[PDB]
Assembly symmetry: D2
Homo-oligomer: 124 residues x 4
């Protein structure tokens, strides 16, 4: 079977794009995230990301996580998922995310986290 590789340019269901560079032997990678929409009335852009792929047992379809450090807001998003070979033999990232808003008071902390999915496929 193919190995599923994180390295490449990706697009998701919402029209956002993402690039991920080479993964080092420690499983670390950097990338960029170019977002389609926004929960702010601020314009979007490219924002950097950093994360790791799990290399335990050197699975062909590894789990990974990354953090997006939004450059156009005070928020942070983390993504986590797995690099699968799909039924049709394509690479697919199946991910879920938490979007953390900045709040001014610790008493608003409870409503500062949104959750959802994103499915990435390779954009050539």
């Amino acid at each position: 079977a193919r190995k599923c590789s994180l390295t490449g340019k990706w697009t998701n269901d919402l029209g956002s794009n993402m690039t991920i560079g080479a993964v080092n032997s420690r499983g670390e990678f950097t990338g960029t995230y170019t977002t389609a929409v926004t929960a702010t009335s601020n314009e979007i852009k490219e924002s950097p990301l950093h994360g790791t792929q799990n290399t335990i047992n050197k699975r062909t379809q590894p789990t990974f996580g990354f953090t997006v450090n939004w450059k156009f807001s005070e928020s942070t998003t983390v993504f986590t998922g797995q690099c699968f070979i799909d039924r049709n033999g394509k690479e697919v990232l199946k991910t879920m995310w938490l979007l953390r808003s900045s709040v001014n008071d610790i008493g608003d902390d409870w409503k500062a986290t949104r959750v959802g999915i994103n499915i990435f496929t390779r954009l050539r």
Copy 2:
């Protein structure tokens, strides 16, 4: 200014130490859980520097060294005069078959204070 650097412990008794935060907001650390005895896994993340908030949001990934899983944590560094990290996490399990993907993600909270 609530800062991520230092030694932390959470509501479950796990420990975490985080190094210096660089100008791009990036930091690395080690996450410590007990089952055997104690396990140590690297973590890497960033804090948000937009508006240079005294109470910044942040994120990090734990690359578990004892399983195939990955966890990401995100939240906000609060300063009352004690510092507290309020976080939520997603724990992604490895599945073999994409048909099992639906059940591979767990979610929860952790609250960290200085150890």
Copy 3:
């Protein structure tokens, strides 16, 4: 007006039928998954009636009859001209010891269309 009453199927191939929605917005139904063959569990929930929106939010609980677990789903009934339910769910597993509570909750999405 996007309506919850009827027969639905999701992206995983599970089926769901929901009865009439009463004046308090309450409804009951049956949720159908395949493993054996097919299982049937009751569900109960409400749709939100504030402002009598054409595309209302809603929630429901599935009381699984084949395990000790419970799932809740919440989301919004959209009308494009096809009706689509966009939902997220939490699947709560039973643990024996409160010390295991942290890992008892999974999260995901389901999208339902008319069957």
Copy 4:
């Protein structure tokens, strides 16, 4: 050991209160939710809830779920968790929730779900 029972008045970490009535033999219950804060600039109140407790194997510490049908907004929250006897012998509900906002466009669906926890203890 005690059985953990849903029936009663409860308070959580945020200061919200909740009542749950008798649970019927089908595991069904009704209740009310009186909330401390809000993600809206609307005032709070009492809102009804309905849900079920799992009775498979008649566990002493059952899982359950319920839906809160907010009367002061277009949103809906679902809660799910387990009724534990804690280390100190008290009943505790350990729950997690999804708060679904109403959006006007299906294209905003992605940011319409927030997530968090709530810990309930009996208020006498």
